[PDB]
Scaffold this motif. Sequence first.
Motif, PDB file in Angstrom:
ATOM      1  N   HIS B  83       0.863  -1.169   0.000  1.00  0.00           N
ATOM      2  CA  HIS B  83       0.000   0.000   0.000  1.00  0.00           C
ATOM      3  C   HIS B  83       0.898   1.217   0.000  1.00  0.00           C
ATOM      4  O   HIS B  83       2.085   1.114   0.308  1.00  0.00           O
ATOM      5  CB  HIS B  83      -0.882   0.031   1.259  1.00  0.00           C
ATOM      6  CG  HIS B  83      -1.894  -1.071   1.328  1.00  0.00           C
ATOM      7  ND1 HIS B  83      -3.041  -1.074   0.561  1.00  0.00           N
ATOM      8  CD2 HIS B  83      -1.935  -2.205   2.070  1.00  0.00           C
ATOM      9  CE1 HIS B  83      -3.757  -2.145   0.844  1.00  0.00           C
ATOM     10  NE2 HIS B  83      -3.104  -2.857   1.748  1.00  0.00           N
ATOM     11  N   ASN B  84       0.318   2.377  -0.301  1.00  0.00           N
ATOM     12  CA  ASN B  84       1.027   3.647  -0.196  1.00  0.00           C
ATOM     13  C   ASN B  84       0.012   4.769  -0.006  1.00  0.00           C
ATOM     14  O   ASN B  84      -1.170   4.501   0.239  1.00  0.00           O
ATOM     15  CB  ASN B  84       1.922   3.896  -1.415  1.00  0.00           C
ATOM     16  CG  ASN B  84       1.138   4.079  -2.717  1.00  0.00           C
ATOM     17  OD1 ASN B  84      -0.078   3.837  -2.781  1.00  0.00           O
ATOM     18  ND2 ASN B  84       1.832   4.524  -3.758  1.00  0.00           N
ATOM     19  N   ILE B  85       0.472   6.018  -0.111  1.00  0.00           N
ATOM     20  CA  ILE B  85      -0.427   7.157  -0.020  1.00  0.00           C
ATOM     21  C   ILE B  85      -0.041   8.313  -0.938  1.00  0.00           C
ATOM     22  O   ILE B  85       1.132   8.685  -1.029  1.00  0.00           O
ATOM     23  CB  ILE B  85      -0.612   7.643   1.456  1.00  0.00           C
ATOM     24  CG1 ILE B  85      -1.820   8.596   1.571  1.00  0.00           C
ATOM     25  CG2 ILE B  85       0.739   8.155   2.098  1.00  0.00           C
ATOM     26  CD1 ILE B  85      -2.271   8.837   2.993  1.00  0.00           C
ATOM     27  N   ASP B  86      -1.055   8.851  -1.619  1.00  0.00           N
ATOM     28  CA  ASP B  86      -0.952   9.993  -2.525  1.00  0.00           C
ATOM     29  C   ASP B  86      -1.773  11.092  -1.865  1.00  0.00           C
ATOM     30  O   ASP B  86      -2.995  10.970  -1.762  1.00  0.00           O
ATOM     31  CB  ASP B  86      -1.537   9.588  -3.896  1.00  0.00           C
ATOM     32  CG  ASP B  86      -1.662  10.737  -4.907  1.00  0.00           C
ATOM     33  OD1 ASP B  86      -1.439  11.924  -4.605  1.00  0.00           O
ATOM     34  OD2 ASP B  86      -2.030  10.396  -6.049  1.00  0.00           O
ATOM     35  N   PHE B  87      -1.088  12.128  -1.379  1.00  0.00           N
ATOM     36  CA  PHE B  87      -1.721  13.351  -0.881  1.00  0.00           C
ATOM     37  C   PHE B  87      -1.868  14.322  -2.039  1.00  0.00           C
ATOM     38  O   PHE B  87      -0.873  14.808  -2.577  1.00  0.00           O
ATOM     39  CB  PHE B  87      -0.859  14.041   0.178  1.00  0.00           C
ATOM     40  CG  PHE B  87      -0.892  13.378   1.530  1.00  0.00           C
ATOM     41  CD1 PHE B  87      -1.887  13.720   2.455  1.00  0.00           C
ATOM     42  CD2 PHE B  87       0.060  12.396   1.868  1.00  0.00           C
ATOM     43  CE1 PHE B  87      -1.906  13.137   3.720  1.00  0.00           C
ATOM     44  CE2 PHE B  87       0.050  11.797   3.138  1.00  0.00           C
ATOM     45  CZ  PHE B  87      -0.942  12.160   4.062  1.00  0.00           C
ATOM     46  N   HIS B  88      -3.100  14.618  -2.420  1.00  0.00           N
ATOM     47  CA  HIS B  88      -3.304  15.641  -3.442  1.00  0.00           C
ATOM     48  C   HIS B  88      -2.884  17.007  -2.909  1.00  0.00           C
ATOM     49  O   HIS B  88      -2.738  17.935  -3.686  1.00  0.00           O
ATOM     50  CB  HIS B  88      -4.755  15.719  -3.843  1.00  0.00           C
ATOM     51  CG  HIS B  88      -5.236  14.541  -4.621  1.00  0.00           C
ATOM     52  ND1 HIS B  88      -6.480  14.527  -5.215  1.00  0.00           N
ATOM     53  CD2 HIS B  88      -4.664  13.346  -4.909  1.00  0.00           C
ATOM     54  CE1 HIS B  88      -6.650  13.377  -5.843  1.00  0.00           C
ATOM     55  NE2 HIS B  88      -5.555  12.649  -5.680  1.00  0.00           N
ATOM     56  N   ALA B  89      -2.740  17.137  -1.580  1.00  0.00           N
ATOM     57  CA  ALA B  89      -2.246  18.377  -0.949  1.00  0.00           C
ATOM     58  C   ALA B  89      -0.745  18.662  -1.166  1.00  0.00           C
ATOM     59  O   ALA B  89      -0.276  19.803  -0.966  1.00  0.00           O
ATOM     60  CB  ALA B  89      -2.557  18.346   0.563  1.00  0.00           C
ATOM     61  N   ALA B  90      -0.017  17.632  -1.588  1.00  0.00           N
ATOM     62  CA  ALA B  90       1.448  17.609  -1.611  1.00  0.00           C
ATOM     63  C   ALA B  90       2.029  17.815  -2.999  1.00  0.00           C
ATOM     64  O   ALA B  90       1.379  17.505  -4.001  1.00  0.00           O
ATOM     65  CB  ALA B  90       1.965  16.279  -1.049  1.00  0.00           C
ATOM     66  N   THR B  91       3.287  18.261  -3.052  1.00  0.00           N
ATOM     67  CA  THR B  91       3.971  18.460  -4.344  1.00  0.00           C
ATOM     68  C   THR B  91       5.130  17.479  -4.488  1.00  0.00           C
ATOM     69  O   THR B  91       6.044  17.481  -3.649  1.00  0.00           O
ATOM     70  CB  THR B  91       4.524  19.893  -4.451  1.00  0.00           C
ATOM     71  OG1 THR B  91       3.439  20.821  -4.327  1.00  0.00           O
ATOM     72  CG2 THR B  91       5.258  20.092  -5.784  1.00  0.00           C
ATOM     73  N   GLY B  92       5.105  16.656  -5.544  1.00  0.00           N
ATOM     74  CA  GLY B  92       6.219  15.731  -5.821  1.00  0.00           C
ATOM     75  C   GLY B  92       5.949  14.246  -5.622  1.00  0.00           C
ATOM     76  O   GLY B  92       5.022  13.859  -4.901  1.00  0.00           O
ATOM     77  N   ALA B  93       6.763  13.419  -6.286  1.00  0.00           N
ATOM     78  CA  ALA B  93       6.743  11.939  -6.140  1.00  0.00           C
ATOM     79  C   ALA B  93       5.329  11.358  -6.101  1.00  0.00           C
ATOM     80  O   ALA B  93       4.952  10.620  -5.178  1.00  0.00           O
ATOM     81  CB  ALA B  93       7.522  11.503  -4.886  1.00  0.00           C
ATOM     82  N   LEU B  94       4.532  11.727  -7.099  1.00  0.00           N
ATOM     83  CA  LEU B  94       3.179  11.227  -7.235  1.00  0.00           C
ATOM     84  C   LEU B  94       2.363  11.436  -5.945  1.00  0.00           C
ATOM     85  O   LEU B  94       1.668  10.530  -5.473  1.00  0.00           O
ATOM     86  CB  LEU B  94       3.202   9.757  -7.693  1.00  0.00           C
ATOM     87  CG  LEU B  94       3.872   9.517  -9.063  1.00  0.00           C
ATOM     88  CD1 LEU B  94       4.154   8.015  -9.263  1.00  0.00           C
ATOM     89  CD2 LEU B  94       3.027  10.088 -10.201  1.00  0.00           C
ATOM     90  N   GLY B  95       2.471  12.651  -5.400  1.00  0.00           N
ATOM     91  CA  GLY B  95       1.780  13.061  -4.173  1.00  0.00           C
ATOM     92  C   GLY B  95       2.310  12.394  -2.920  1.00  0.00           C
ATOM     93  O   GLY B  95       1.676  12.461  -1.881  1.00  0.00           O
ATOM     94  N   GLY B  96       3.477  11.748  -3.022  1.00  0.00           N
ATOM     95  CA  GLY B  96       3.979  10.918  -1.928  1.00  0.00           C
ATOM     96  C   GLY B  96       3.877   9.440  -2.245  1.00  0.00           C
ATOM     97  O   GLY B  96       4.536   8.635  -1.584  1.00  0.00           O
ATOM     98  N   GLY B  97       3.034   9.079  -3.220  1.00  0.00           N
ATOM     99  CA  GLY B  97       2.880   7.677  -3.643  1.00  0.00           C
ATOM    100  C   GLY B  97       4.225   7.003  -3.908  1.00  0.00           C
ATOM    101  O   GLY B  97       4.440   5.823  -3.555  1.00  0.00           O
TER     102      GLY B  97
END
Lengths: 328, 328, 328
Positions: B83-97
Motif C-alpha cells: 500500500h502507499n499514499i498519494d496526498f493531493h495536498a502535496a507536491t512531488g513523487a506522485l503526491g507521496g505515492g
Amino acid sequence: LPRVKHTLVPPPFAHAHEQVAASGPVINEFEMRIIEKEVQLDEDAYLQAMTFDGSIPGPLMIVHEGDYVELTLINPPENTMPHNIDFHAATGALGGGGLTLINPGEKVVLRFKATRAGAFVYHCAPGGPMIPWHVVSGMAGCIMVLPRDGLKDHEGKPVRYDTVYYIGESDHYIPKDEDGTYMRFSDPSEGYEDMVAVMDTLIPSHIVFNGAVGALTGEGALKAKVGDNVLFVHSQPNRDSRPHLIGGHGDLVWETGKFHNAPERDLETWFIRGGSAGAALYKFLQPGVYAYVNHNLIEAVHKGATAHVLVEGEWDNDLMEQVVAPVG
Amino acid sequence: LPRVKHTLVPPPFAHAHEQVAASGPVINEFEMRIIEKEVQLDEDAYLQAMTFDGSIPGPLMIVHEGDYVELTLINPPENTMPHNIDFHAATGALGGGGLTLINPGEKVVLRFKATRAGAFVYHCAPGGPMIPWHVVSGMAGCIMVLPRDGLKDHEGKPVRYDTVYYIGESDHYIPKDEDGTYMRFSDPSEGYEDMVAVMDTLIPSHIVFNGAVGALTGEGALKAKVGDNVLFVHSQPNRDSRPHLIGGHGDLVWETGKFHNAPERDLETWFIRGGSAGAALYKFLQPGVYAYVNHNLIEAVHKGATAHVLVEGEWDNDLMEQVVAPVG
Amino acid sequence: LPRVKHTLVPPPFAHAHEQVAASGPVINEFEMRIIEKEVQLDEDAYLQAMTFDGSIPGPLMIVHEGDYVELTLINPPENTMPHNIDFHAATGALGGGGLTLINPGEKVVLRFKATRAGAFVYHCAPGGPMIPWHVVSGMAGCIMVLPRDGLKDHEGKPVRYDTVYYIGESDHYIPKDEDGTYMRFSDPSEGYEDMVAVMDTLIPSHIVFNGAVGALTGEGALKAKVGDNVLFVHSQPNRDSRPHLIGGHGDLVWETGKFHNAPERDLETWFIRGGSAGAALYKFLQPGVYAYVNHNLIEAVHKGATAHVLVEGEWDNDLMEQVVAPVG
Ligand SMILES: [Cu+2]
Ligand SMILES: [Cu+2]
Ligand SMILES: [Cu+2]
Ligand SMILES: [Cu+2]
Ligand SMILES: [Cu+2]
Ligand SMILES: [Cu+2]
Ligand SMILES: [Mg+2]
Ligand SMILES: [Mg+2]
Ligand SMILES: [Mg+2]
Ligand SMILES: [Mg+2]
Ligand SMILES: [Mg+2]
Ligand SMILES: [Mg+2]
Ligand SMILES: [Mg+2]
Ligand SMILES: [Mg+2]
Ligand SMILES: [Mg+2]
C-alpha cells in the motif's frame, strides 16, 4: 489584413505561434484532410476511425481573438462518408457545420471570425445520428483562440507558458463478442449497428488520450523541466472528464476554457464538460515522473485515460522528504 | 518549528483544531494503520475493504497552509497487499505515492509541506490497475489545509464554522450472481477479477457516505442547532457527486475545494469532481430533519448516498408555513 | 403585502412577468394539479408518468427575491399515489416536502419566502425509494427567483432578456424486453419493479426536453430573431447535463443557477448538476437553425436531448462565410 499560412503539427504538440499576437488581426489559413482508417486503440482493440488530418484528436489550431480562420477541408475520394466541421469557436450555421458538408472527392473553404478567446472543441457533425457517431469515431480536435495580449490571471496580470500540450481525450464504443473480446469490421458502416448498441449503454469501451491506450506513456511520455510553466489544453467532445496531474496541481485553471473568465487556483482536480476544452497552467517544482489522468481512476487505468510526464531537475526536500524509508 | 502530535478521530468527526492558526508554521505528526477487512456495505452486501485507520473514508487531517505534515504509515503483517499514499495536498513523487510503498510488516514516514489551502483527497495508489482497485476498496480520505487566518468569503471577510463534518462518499463495485445477489470472497485478491468486471461497466453497486448504507442515518444522523454554521467537507476520490442539503442551501460553497478561490453563494446543489474534495458552509435557520444527499436521487436512495441531519431549535413561520393542511 | 395570482403557462414558455420587480414584496399565488398519466416519450416508448400540471417539466414559476410563494397543490381522487413538493428555493421542512404530502382526494397550501435569487428545481419527494421514482416519472419543474432589480452581469451591470425559455431536461428509465423494445404497464405501480432494475444501471433509456423526444424540434422548434437576448433556463432534477447552443455561445452563464454569483462569459458548453437549474443568456447574431443540445451527443441524439431554434434575420458574412463551396 495579412494572411498567415500555418503548418499543423500532430497532437500533443502545437504548431509555431506567439502568445502575445505579434500583429493586428490576420486571416489564418489552415488545411486538413479527412482520413478514414482503422486504428489500434489497445492490444486487441481496433476502431473504424474517422479523423481530421489522420490524428485523434485532430491537430491543435492556435490563433488570436479578432483574427479570422480560413479552413480548407478535404474529403478524399477514398473515403466512404460525407463529413463536415463544427467550430465551437465560430458564430453561425451550426458552427460551420451547415456550410462545410463535403462528399468523398470534394473540398470546401470556410471562413469565420474568432470573436471569442478560449480553447474550443471542433468536431464533425453531419446531421442526425451521424453526429455522435462521427465524433465517437475520433472526429474532433481543438482550436485555441488566445487573447491578443496573451493569457491573464484572476487579477489581470499577464501570464506566460513555456510549453502547451494538447491532450485530446476521446471516448469510444467498440462492440464486443459475448466473451468480452472486441469485434473487427471492414469499414465504419459495417460496424455501425453494433457500435450504436454500445453507444446506447453510455459506457465507453475505451477512453484515451492522443488516440490510443498508452499513446502518451512510455516512448510517448510528455517531457518538461523543473521551472517550466506548462499549459495543458484538454478537450473532450462527447463526455465529461476530471483531469488530475498526480504530484502537481493546476496553478491557474480555466476548466470551462474561456480565457476572459477568471481562472481558479491551486486545484487538485478540475472538470472538462463533454463538448468542451479547458486549460490548466502548472509550474513544475519537483523532478520525476508525473501522471496526468482522468481521476475516475477506472477511466484512467482500465479505459486508457493516463498520460505520463517526465520532469528533469533538482529535487526540493523542503516540499517533500522521505524521513523514514520503508523499514520492518 | 514546533511539533504537534494529533490524535485522529473517525469520520464524520474531526480531531481537535483551531480555524485561525494559533501559531506560526508547525510540523504536524499523524499516524495511520492500514486495515484490510471485509466490511458490510448493506444488508446482504459486503466489500473486501482496504482502509486507512479502519474507516471509510480514512480520517480527516486538519492543518494550516505553510505547515508541514509528517505521516507515519503502517502496513501491519496481517495484511496481504502493499500500500502507499498519494496526498493531493502535496507536491512531488506522485503526491507521496512514490515514497510510501510499504509491504505488510513495514512502516514509512513521509514529510511534505502543505503549501496550498483547501480540502484535498488522500488515497492509496500503488501502481497500475492496483490504483483504481485500492481506491474503490475504500482506501481514501481527506486532509483539510486551512488558510492560516481561517476561511474568507467572496469579499475577503473572515468566516467561521461551529462544526465541520467530513462526508466521505465512496463508489464500490461488488460482483453479483445472475439473480442480482452479491458475491462473497475470502480476501480482496480472491474477489479481484469479478470486481474488475463490475468496474469496467462504470456502474457502482453502492455509493455510500461514511462506509455503509445508512451510516449517517438513524443512530448515525448528524446533529446541529438552529444558528449553527456547519462546514460540510465532501470527498469523492473516484467518481463525481452532486451534493444537496434538502431544505437548505450552500451559503458559501467552494465546490472545487480550494479556499483562496472565491466561493459561490446560495447554491441548491453543487458538484464534487471525482478525485477531489469540496466544502460548503451553511447556517441552519429552521429546525427539523434535513437530508444531505447526492442529487442523482437513484444514487442517493438506491445506491446509498444519503445522510440525515437532525436540527433542534425554533421554527420560523416567516420562512415557511403550512397555510392549509392536507384536507379533502 | 399585495397578493398576485398567476396563471401558469406550459413549458417551454413562461407566465407573464416583469424582470425588474414592478412592486415591493408580494405574495405570489400559484395552483397546480398533479396528473398521473401514461405519456409517449418516443415512437414506441411510453412512460407511466407523474406530473405537475400535466406537463414534463412542471411549469415555470417566476417571482422576485424577498417575495412569498403560496402554492395550492391538488392531488385529484383519480390518482393512485401520494405526492408532495420540495422547492429547492425554500428553507425548511425538506423544501416543503414535509408539509405537503397529500393523498388522492386532498389539497394543501404551502407558503414560503423566496429569500434567495436564482433558478431552482422543484420536485416531488414523498419519502424513501418513492423519491427517485416520482422524479424519474416526470415530477419536477423550476421556479425562477429574479433579483428585485433584475439580472446583473459579472461587473454588476443590469442585463435584460427579450425571451426566457424553460428547458426541462429529464432522464427516464423505461424497462425493455430482451429484444430491446419497451414495456407497457397499466399504471405506475405495475411498472415499478421493472423500472427499479433499469434505475439501478444508472443508464436512462431516454433523456428528453419538454417531456418527449422531438418535443422542441419540428413544429415544436423554439423561435427567435437576430438581436434577441434569450435566457435559456435549464433544469435537470436527477442527472447531469452539459448544454450547448450549436452555432452560438453562452454570453453570460450561471451554470449553478444563482443570480448573485458572477456569470462566466463566452462559454461553448456549460454544466447543469443533477438536482439543479442553471441559466444562460445569449444574443443571437446570425439567422438560421440552431440546435440546443446536451453535448454528450449520444444523449443528445440517441436519448432525445435535442431542441431546435429557428432564428430569423440578416446573415453577417463578417462572422462567417463559405469562401469556396463544396467542389470536386
Ligand atoms: Cu465526419
Ligand atoms: Cu458541438
Ligand atoms: Cu492500498
Ligand atoms: Cu489522485
Ligand atoms: Cu409524486
Ligand atoms: Cu431536491
Ligand atoms: Mg497537411
Ligand atoms: Mg472475439
Ligand atoms: Mg504561481
Ligand atoms: Mg491510531
Ligand atoms: Mg447469491
Ligand atoms: Mg450568510
Ligand atoms: Mg391550472
Ligand atoms: Mg416488446
Ligand atoms: Mg455581450
